[PDB]
Amino acid sequence: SYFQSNVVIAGCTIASAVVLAHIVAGIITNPATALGGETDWAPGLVALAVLWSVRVVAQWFQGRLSQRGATAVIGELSRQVLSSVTTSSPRRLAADRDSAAAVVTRGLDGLRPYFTGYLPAVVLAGILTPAALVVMAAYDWQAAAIVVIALPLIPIFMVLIGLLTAERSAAALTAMTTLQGRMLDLIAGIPTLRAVGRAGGSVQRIAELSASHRRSTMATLRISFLSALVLELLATLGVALVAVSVGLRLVFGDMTLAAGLTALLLAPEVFWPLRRVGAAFHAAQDGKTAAEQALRLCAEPHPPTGHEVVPAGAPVIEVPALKAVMEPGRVTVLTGPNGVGKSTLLQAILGLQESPCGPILVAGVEVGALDRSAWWGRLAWMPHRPVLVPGTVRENLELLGPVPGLDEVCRSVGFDEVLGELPDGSETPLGRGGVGLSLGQRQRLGLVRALGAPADVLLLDQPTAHLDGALEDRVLAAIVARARAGATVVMVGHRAPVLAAADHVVTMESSLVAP
Amino acid sequence: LRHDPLLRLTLELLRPRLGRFLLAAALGVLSLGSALALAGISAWLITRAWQMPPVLDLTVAVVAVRALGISRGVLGYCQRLASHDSALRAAANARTGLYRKLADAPPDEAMRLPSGELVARLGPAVDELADVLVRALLPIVVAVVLGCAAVGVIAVISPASAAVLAVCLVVAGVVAPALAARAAHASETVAAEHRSQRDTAGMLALEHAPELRVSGRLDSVIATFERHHRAWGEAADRAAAPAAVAAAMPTAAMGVSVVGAVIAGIALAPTVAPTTAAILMLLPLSAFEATTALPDAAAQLMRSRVAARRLLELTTPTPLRSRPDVATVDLAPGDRLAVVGPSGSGKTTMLMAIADRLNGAGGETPQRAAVFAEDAHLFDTTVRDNLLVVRGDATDTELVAALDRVGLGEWLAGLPDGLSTVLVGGAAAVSAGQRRRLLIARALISAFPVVLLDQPTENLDAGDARQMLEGLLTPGALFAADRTVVVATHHLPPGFDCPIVRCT
Ligand SMILES: Nc1ncnc2c1ncn2[C@@H]1O[C@H](COP(=O)(O)OP(=O)(O)OP(=O)(O)O)[C@@H](O)[C@H]1O
Ligand SMILES: Nc1ncnc2c1ncn2[C@@H]1O[C@H](COP(=O)(O)OP(=O)(O)OP(=O)(O)O)[C@@H](O)[C@H]1O
Ligand SMILES: [Mg+2]
Ligand SMILES: [Mg+2]
């Protein structure tokens, strides 16, 4: 652990200092004598080298342990932040993402100096310094009592510096999150800016953000280096004070020579660990504030959900607020103006957020009490824009799990005529968001992912978008066939072919929660 | 080397200045000055103030040591400030140059990499490049200069021994960086390739959380995040260890050389010439301090060579297939077009070809045509700033008029800050139809003589889609008189007007 390795290091340092002081004392008192047996110059060097090697080995072991522990802790914290943020309501997720992303990617990595050079430094300062003081007092108590007078100053200086840098740490963290988020957003919108011709105007704002970040970092650095210089001067003056004292007491012959060398060699050992702690504190501050932000993000209560499970088969979904009942085996079309909680109604039926209009009941039992894990296993949901990550077409078809019957679903939806026209088949690379495929082909890929799956309830948010008349008819025929196969289908189309394709139409109106 | 593409890449993006590099090297050389001068003025009770009482000598020695310490501390503070300022300037320049390179390339090339890869390459890689500037350039130039000067100086006292000393110093300062680099490179490649997979799955979980949650694939993404974090940690430890031992070996070499030098300096060295002691305390100390600094420089060399390789592979990706050629369409200043066809025919391709023909490549600053693609971006900024991405000199009255005439007057009236609402999430803060209307308002606010719209009435209302499309294709409803409007649509009414350029 920290204790054993730090004890070994402190003991080795103290013993090396004492041994060196004694040998220089022996050589001074015996300038040209003692050669040819018990030289006190040959056999002491081997002990000094052995102590140095032991100290190096202990430092290596401590570093390995610290690195492993830091990796484990950072991984656990990142997992906590990801599991907390991503499993919340979509509005809260969109609110606090691009801030959880920063602390997860570039923020929590700053905790490595905290575990690999700050905590060991603190432990070594707590161990070696009293031990060095005790050994110096045993050899020459006057020197130790004289040095203990400069000791309390350095902790007070550390307290002042920490009080004055705590806020700058958080300011730098916020600047970093803002810069990363804005850069990602600007890169995401390069095609739009190039289409409108204003592509070269975003480089300027990127430059302003980068300059701001550089200025903040330079300010902090300046403060840190000034603090390090002040600590170095403090320790050097504290050492020189006792150096003067012992030198004066040695010139007039009041003290023994070996005790003087021992005190002079053990004086810097009192103050070195404090300088190391002061240097490590500034390095660890960024990780400290990133971790504090990470726990702030993670510490948020999520609404609880019950363990109720819907019975086997296609259930019945009722929304009494709109007098809507979606029976199994029939297609129900949700229509209304642009903004009356239709996609929100779908997401409330899923259970991702609260219902815009009254309570939602699935087979009697309320949605809020349903076991979400098991409930989502009986659903197939197709949002407005299906997820299409960079990669191949085959990788995107398997993004949301496997498709049992990919060929038949592709034939029914019409995606087989898309794979055929691609020169590489289902292996063509795709860009971000589906670049490399057209909007109708992206919609058909999403429809293949959604329609072909083991599910009893189908939720589709305008499924026939970007499709011409023939493809619209084919897709609606496939949806109607799936409904005829004993499933609950809830379309959110508001066009004539979609409306005249369902056995029930709900005309959900405004003044529900938001317009 | 000069023809290395990585070298040219880091020379452009990380553009340095010779003045700061020379200043840092001079500051290091001057920091060696106190090391030279600790014993260069008060060797014994001879050199300084001839002969003096012991207490006077003690006081002089203490004050000289403290003054030298103060000077070294101030010099180190200045050198650290200069080096870190240079690193920050280089990092900012590299980030700006990377974004400019991305924005100058065709837009489909910027969409090849995921968000996690973009984060991993625009953060730590740029930091590593700035680190290579500072840490690669300073100790190395210092070691080379110090070693060459020391060998040249010692070639006079004993050239036969000068050859041996040069051989030993070169052997040490070559084998230690060689071991450091050979340990660092292979492990750091794996570490980088694991780091730019940990955050890919971990930003995928953040942007698309609800879909993965409903599909039951979020636990897998988080598991991949954890696994790649573990792999990166092991790779970093494997990088660290042998570099540590290879850097520790110079320290033992330094100790042995110092002890041997002192022992040789207690053998008739004060005789003949006392400055031989100063030379003997100057040469090994500086040379071996530089040798001890070298292994970290070699490790930084390898790390940022990997980083620069990643950056270059980000800047220039392999192109995808080319969109099919389309028939040229003649346009008139005031015409209305209704390009139609099936869902794979190439209406968007024809719109872009028409825009390219009208713009006539570069050299035509007044851009004649602009394509408003259906998947256009909604930024995470205010509504006014979202609308001003097209025309930056539009007053709020014009913005409000456009919003009211595209059907978003009631939406804007209900916004907490009106035109200053932040729209957190971009397209996630609005609804499909509202986003479509916002894009139509963007098109309306524009000042382009030719406006090419791509499926502008998608996700719109039943009672507003047909009227909006007819107004778009009416020569006086939304775009008036001298504006050409080309609309690629899927819902053209059966009974209507204006020419059709249907595809196949
Ligand atoms: N963070 C948010 N995410 C989604 N909708 C939001 C958010 N904040 C406010 N809203 C508002 O929620 C309301 C409901 O939008 P919703 O997407 O549920 O409607 P819709 O019926 O699907 O309409 P559309 O025809 O546009 O798809 C809109 O007024 C929208 O602007
Ligand atoms: N980089 C690319 N981005 C998009 N489509 C591409 C690209 N390269 C080739 N294509 C192909 O070009 C063809 C025409 O696509 P385009 O987007 O022009 O069609 P569209 O008529 O607009 O169809 P839709 O109505 O589905 O949008 C398609 O086969 C498409 O996959
Ligand atoms: Mg919607
Ligand atoms: Mg298109």
Author numbering:
A (entry chain C): -5 to 509
B (entry chain A): 4 to 507
Sentences copied from the publication:
In the NBD of MsCydC, half of the Linking Loop, the β1 strand, and the A-loop are missing. The rest of the Linking Loop then connects directly with β2, forming a new “Linking-β2 Loop” which passes through the front side of NBD and covers the ATP-binding site. Arg324 and Arg326 in the Linking-β2 Loop play an important role in stabilizing ATP by sandwiching its adenosine ring. In the NBD of MsCydD, the β1–β2 hairpin becomes really short by deleting a fragment containing the A-loop, so that the distance between the adenosine group of ATP and the tip of hairpin (Ala315) is 21 Å. To rescue the function of NBD, the adenosine ring of ATP is stabilized by the sidechain of Arg85 from ICL1 located between TM2 and TM3. At the periplasmic side of TMDs, there are significant shifts for the TM helices in the outward-facing state of MsCydDC. The TM3–TM4 pair, TM5–TM6 pair and TM1 of MsCydC all move away from the center of the helix bundle. Thus, the central cavity opens towards the periplasm and gaps are created between TM1C and TM6C, and between TM5C and TM2D. In the ATP-bound structures, the two axial His residues are 12.9 Å far away from each other in MsCydDC (or 12.7 Å in EcCydDC).
